[PDB]
Amino acid sequence: KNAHAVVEQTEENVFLIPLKHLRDSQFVGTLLVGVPPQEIHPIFDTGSTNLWVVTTDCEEESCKKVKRYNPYKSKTFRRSFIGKNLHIVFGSGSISGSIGKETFVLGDHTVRNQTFGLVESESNNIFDYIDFEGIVGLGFPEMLSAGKVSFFDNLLSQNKNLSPQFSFYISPEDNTSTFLVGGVSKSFYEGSIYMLPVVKEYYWEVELDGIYVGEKKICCEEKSYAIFDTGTSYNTMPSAQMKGFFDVVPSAPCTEENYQEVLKNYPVIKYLFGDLVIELLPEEYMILNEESCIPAYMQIDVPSEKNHAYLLGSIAFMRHYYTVFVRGAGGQPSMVGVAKARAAAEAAQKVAELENF
Ligand SMILES: *[C@@H]1O[C@H](CO)[C@@H](O[C@@H]2O[C@H](CO)[C@@H](O[C@@H]3O[C@H](CO)[C@@H](O)[C@H](O)[C@@H]3O)[C@H](O)[C@H]2NC(C)=O)[C@H](O)[C@H]1NC(C)=O
Ligand SMILES: CCC1(CC)CC(=O)N([C@@H]2CCOc3ccc(C(=O)N[C@H]4CC(C)(C)Oc5ccccc54)cc32)C(=N)N1
DSSP, X not given: OOOEEEEEEOGGGXXXXXXXXXXXXXXXXXXXXXXXXXXXXXXXXTTOOOEXXXXXXXXXXXXXXXXXXXXXXXXXXXXXXXXXXXXXXXXXXXXXXXXXXXXXXXXTEEEEEEEEEEEEEXXXXXXXXXXXXXXXXXXXXXXXXXXXXXXXXXXXXXXXXXXXXXXEEOOGGGTXXXXXXXXXXXXXXXXXXXXXXXXXXXXXXXXXXXXEETTEEEEOSSOEEEEEOTTOSXXXXXXXXXXXXXXXXXXXXXXXXXXXXXXXXXXXXXXEETTEEEEEOHHHHEEEOSSEEEESEEEOOOTGGGGOEEEEOIIIIITTEEEEXXXXXXXXXXXXXXXXXXXXXXXXXXXXXXXXX
């Protein structure tokens, strides 16, 4: 019931990371590792928390094709005397490596003593189709596989000018996509921001009360949730619902010249977050793919939350909605704020942060 305010900040307290939309579909920024600095181009992933860097310890083909980080060239790289192995399995691949500490620079801000995973193996594969160099995880610290301090938390603890919030502006056809640390920019949205409380600090997870495709109620008979996950380009539904969705949302042949008409009669999707209703128009949740219009959706069953979790991804959701991620503390819940994205945005002219009243 207690509101947040958008307050102005000096430009250095909200730093902007340009995100380049690569042909392999990654939105990657720039990250400097160690001294002398080595440059990598990671994705920024609200669906995980570990910091991963691809290293010269991985000699596989998928790793050798990118600019591998070499820890033996870094004066600041440190291993602990007793090492730790890390092995992550997810739907489209696996990542395994060891733990180390390093100094990072993100947006001219320095972070020391940062635990990170050194990729040694990318083989279970998604890595054969992308030029993967790393992940800056932005989930809650509960998802860390190792270390006591997440990258975001550690960055904040060493840079008192930053507020514990960040936001994403996704505009791939513009080359204006931006990851913002410490606040927001009014250049990237219009209307008001509406806040949704985070119900469990693991993923960025909020209550989801219903889903409609046209007039058909696709959700919810049981208590459901939405997860804002920049690490997936697609929106997702659980299996039970995913089949029913594609049954009423078929693909269609399309070109840049006829898709507006092809899709003119497709249904509008609505997500219900309490009194907030978010709608996705056909030209927003359908994407052009190999002479075809296809729904930017995929099936995903999240074992925690009992497969009642629905993911909101970079291309089918954040492209249309500017999203803010606000880190709660103590009795104050973390929150996600959502606003209609401003399509006319160019550069972030001014910057602000959300203050809690
Ligand atoms: C990165 O991690 C290192 C290792 O923990 C940090 O170095 C440590 O920093 C603390 C505080 O600056 C030092 O505390 C000192 O301990 C002596 C006793 O040895 C005490 O009498 C002093 O009053 C002082 O508080 C600690 O010695 C130091 N440890 C080492 C091995 O150098 C470092 O601060 C971390 N860097 C950042 C940016 O957080
Ligand atoms: C980044 C992977 C992890 C953490 C290791 C693990 C993980 O599964 N997810 C989500 C959870 C929900 O289910 C899925 C399902 C699929 C994908 C996927 O294939 N993602 C692609 C996107 C692309 C090609 C742009 O970049 C990369 C870059 C690297 C790896 C994967 C991708 C992601 C998720 C994360 N959010 N993070």
